[PDB]
Structures are given as C-alpha cells and as structure tokens.
Design a protein around this ligand. Sequence first.
Ligand SMILES: CCc1c2c(nn1C)[C@@H](CCN1CCOCC1)OCCCCn1c(C(=O)O)c(CCCOc3cccc4cc(F)ccc34)c3ccc(Cl)c-2c31
Ligand SMILES: OC[C@H]1O[C@H](O[C@H]2[C@H](O)[C@@H](O)[C@@H](O)O[C@@H]2CO)[C@H](O)[C@@H](O)[C@@H]1O
Ligand SMILES: [Mg+2]
Length: 518
Amino acid sequence: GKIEEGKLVIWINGDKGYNGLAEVGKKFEKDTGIKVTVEHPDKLEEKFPQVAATGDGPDIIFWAHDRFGGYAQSGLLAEITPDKAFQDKLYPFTWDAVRYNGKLIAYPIAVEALSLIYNKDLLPNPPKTWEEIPALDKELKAKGKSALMFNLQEPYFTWPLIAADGGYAFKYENGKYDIKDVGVDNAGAKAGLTFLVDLIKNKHMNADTDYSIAEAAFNKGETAMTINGPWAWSNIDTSKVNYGVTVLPTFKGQPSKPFVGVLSAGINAASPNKELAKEFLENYLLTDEGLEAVNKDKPLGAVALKSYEEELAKDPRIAATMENAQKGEIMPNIPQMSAFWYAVRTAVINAASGRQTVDEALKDAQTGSELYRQSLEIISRYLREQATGAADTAPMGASGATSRKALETLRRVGDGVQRNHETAFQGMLRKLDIKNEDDVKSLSRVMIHVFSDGVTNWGRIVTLISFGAFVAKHLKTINQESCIEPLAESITDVLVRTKRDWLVKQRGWDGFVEFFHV
Ligand SMILES: CCc1c2c(nn1C)[C@@H](CCN1CCOCC1)OCCCCn1c(C(=O)O)c(CCCOc3cccc4cc(F)ccc34)c3ccc(Cl)c-2c31
Ligand SMILES: OC[C@H]1O[C@H](O[C@H]2[C@H](O)[C@@H](O)[C@@H](O)O[C@@H]2CO)[C@H](O)[C@@H](O)[C@@H]1O
Ligand SMILES: [Mg+2]
C-alpha cells in the first residue's frame, strides 16, 4: 500500500508503444541507476483511481487527458510545474488539455483522433458518406468481402457518428462548458445511433465486433475499411495491406466528429519519486529521441513537442489525423467524463444487441450522464436552505422541474426524518467531531462504509441527505458555513458512486419523486 522509493513504475495502455517507452526507461536507468518498469494492466484507467486513493499504484500513469480531471479532483495527481523554457517546447493547446482548476496536472504527449482507414487494393476510392456504405457492402459481399468493421464495444469509436447530426456530451458555448446541458438523447444522437443499429440489423456490421476482431479482419484483407487511431498503424504496416488514412465519412451531410484525446502522463500524488518522474518525463521522454522511440513502436499521432511534430508533419496519415481532429472536439476533462463514458458504452452495446431500443438506451445514458450534477443541485440546495432558513433564489436550469420536485419531496420526507431521528442524529454528530474543513473531508470514508453496507432503497438515501442537512445546520452555528458546499459535494459523490446503476434503474430523481408521491 506504499509506492517504493528509488525506482519508477509506469502504467500505459496496451495499445500504445510500451516497448518503446521501456527503451526510454532503459536509457534513464543507464544515466541514473534507477530501474523503470513499464506495465500495461487491463482497465488501468479504472484501477488507477482505486489504488491511488490508498497511496498505491504507479509513479506515472499514461492516458488520454479526459480522465485526468477526475483524478485531480480526487487528489491523486501531483501538480506539474515545468519552467517556461520547457512549456514553450510543447503546443499551448496541449497544455490546455491538462489544465484543471488552474493547475497543470499532467504532461501532454500527443494528440489522437480517429480516422477512416481503408484498403486501397479493395477500395481505391473510399466513401465520402456513411449513407453509401450499405450499397458498398453489398458490392463487396458479392466479392467475398465486407465494407467496414470497427470496435463496437467502446463508445469512443461510435461517438464520431453519434455526434455528427447533433449529439454532444457537455455543451460548450461562450468559452466554457455547461455541465447541466447534456446532449446524449437528442434527435441528432438518436439519428446517428439509429444508423449504426440499422447497419447491424441489415447485416453490414456485427454487434459483437471488438477491437481485436476488427483489427484482424482489416489486417488480413477481409474488410475494406476500419476506424482506428495512429497506434494501430504499426500492425497494419506489418500486415502489408496497402492502406490509406483519410477523413471519416459524413452523416446527413455533416462531418463525423471524433472526440480528440491528448495522451498525457500524470505523476501519482503518493509517489515518493516525483523528482525522478519529472526528470524522466521532461528530459528523456519529451525529447525528439524519446518520442521517436515510442513512435517507432506504435505511432503517437501528432506529438505535443513542436520540434518532433514538425519532423513528422509531412506524413499523410498524420495530416488526416489532424483533419479529422479539426472536425471533432477536444474532450472535456471534467470529473463526470468517466460517468458519461460508462453510460454511453452501455447504451451503444444495448442498442446494438437489441437489449434496448435506441430511445430507451439513450434515455438511460442521458440520466447516467446528468446524475452527478442533478444530485448535487438537489443536495446542495437542501443542505443550504436547511442551514440558513432561506431557499436559493437561483434558477434550477436544465431539468429544473425534476430538481424542484425532488427538492420539494425531500423537504417533506427529509424534514420528517430529521424530526423523528433527532436522537440518533445528535449522537452521530457527537461521535463525529466536525469542527473544520479538514473534518468534513474525513467524512467520506465513514459515510461510504455505513452507506454501502446493506439494502439499497430510497429511505436510506433520505437518511444520508437528511443527516447531511443536520450537519449543515451544525456547520452554520460554528460559523463554518463555507464547509456546507464541500459537504454537499462529498455526499453527492458517495451517493452516485455507490448507487449509480440502481439510481439509473429507478429513472434517477424522477423515481424518487414517484416513490414518495402523495
Ligand atoms: C436512521 C438513523 C440512524 C443512524 C444510526 N442509527 N440510526 C437510527 C447509526 C448509529 C447512530 N448512533 C451512533 C452512535 O452515537 C449515537 C447514534 O448507525 C446506523 C446506520 C444506519 C442508519 N443510517 C444510515 C443508513 O445508511 O441507513 C445513514 C446514512 C449513511 C451514512 O451517512 C453518514 C455517515 C456518517 C457521516 C455522515 C455525514 C453526513 F453529512 C451525511 C451522512 C453521513 C445514517 C446517517 C446518520 C445516522 Cl445517525 C444514521 C444513519
Ligand atoms: O470508449 C470510451 C473511452 O474513449 C477514450 O479512450 C480511448 C483512448 O483515448 C485511446 O487512446 C485508445 O486507447 O482507445 C480508447 C478507447 O478504447 C477515452 O480516453 C476513455 O477515457 C474512454 O473510456
Ligand atoms: Mg496488459
């Protein structure tokens, strides 16, 4: 449960150039005597937050930048403080992708976007539109081939099509996100996912196709096209398929919009090797020779280092990567990105398999993506109005009827719980000795341990939130009102992390209102 001093452990995904990264590690070891271990665990982006929360895990984690905001919000990443001379060596927009709440929380490595990859011997002119792919598949099936195979198990690969006609994750306008404006179940998202499901229904695609199946079929020449990123080009090179990399097809006349990732390297906040890690990343990896070693193993895409990016910029495959990137959007790094991806992953799999209709699947994904912010709105408002005696006048915003009605239900049932359970609430408020902001941050572990043991139902959720209001009242009297919002965030985090699937099954806070109706 403690990271070892005097070595570096690095985690990177198994589709990236980890043997090349290990070569950089060997060069580090030659200068310093410090051994560098590169590992590629399964589901490392899910494992890192669990093990790092205990003070364990790798010294350095590599992932696309979208997951790092969550890690940073949880206190799991060291702040990065490169000097100006180093910062100036990387493109400013890559640093922007690894900024969270004003601080740099990772080193950017390379810019990744999906492209259409096609077999020039089968398909001299790849299709410009998604709509022409069914007819192309029919032509190719008559030749013992198929038009298109790509990974249908990870929503990253289907998102460019879902977004094309108007789907979006979190709305971006006037230089900032509106986290409460989620675009997963609108008409444009439905149109794109319906087109995907229709491709499967019409036998142009198979719902069970995953990364390995699609890669094998393309690299053996059975399918004329795939959708993948730069890391995949190495294995196609080895297959000697005559391939090209080009712009994704349009849908309803609009570009496919891939979510653009910046592969990034974060330092574990619990690492006793932060100076070594910074030395490795700045003076070994993020150099022309270090990125070359990784890129020669599995291509990185458009690297963040200006000097080496210019050296590779003439590669037509990189130009296509950046053309598709310009038509897409840089992913947010907000902490709810993990929940968004989990919700949309399930929606695509369920729609593709027929377990849910497109309408059902996207509705559930919308609820899952909105769950944190909607829960916080309700919980923060209830705690604050209970503590101060006066309600928040600010508009509820999106799903404001749901929030207003849930808050109204909570006012009824939560005030009764606080009345009837004053005895236990007073007793618990003594055992916990909450005096300051530091005491509040300590509550999450006891909260999780009590709340995640036993039956799940709305009554216990009312008890969780009602005791929160009881504590908010206390915080107000000891002149610690500024601790109420952090407390509300902590309660919300416990609720939505421990009860995500159950909450979505109940239709979220709409199920709460109907459970307690009349
Ligand atoms: C129902 C009220 C109640 C409870 C207790 N007894 N009784 C009668 C305490 C024993 C009480 N003894 C202990 C010895 O000093 C005399 C009283 O143990 C039983 C645990 C089950 C009942 N249960 C539940 C529940 O998950 O069901 C909760 C919500 C989950 C845990 O939330 C929190 C825990 C800790 C800090 C929190 C701070 C917050 F800001 C918000 C939630 C917090 C819950 C929350 C508070 C209480 Cl008091 C009870 C709860
Ligand atoms: O599928 C959801 C998934 O999308 C992205 O992960 C990409 C990753 O950025 C690429 O580097 C490559 O490894 O493929 C992954 C998809 O399998 C998000 O970065 C990730 O957080 C998200 O879960
Ligand atoms: Mg592995």
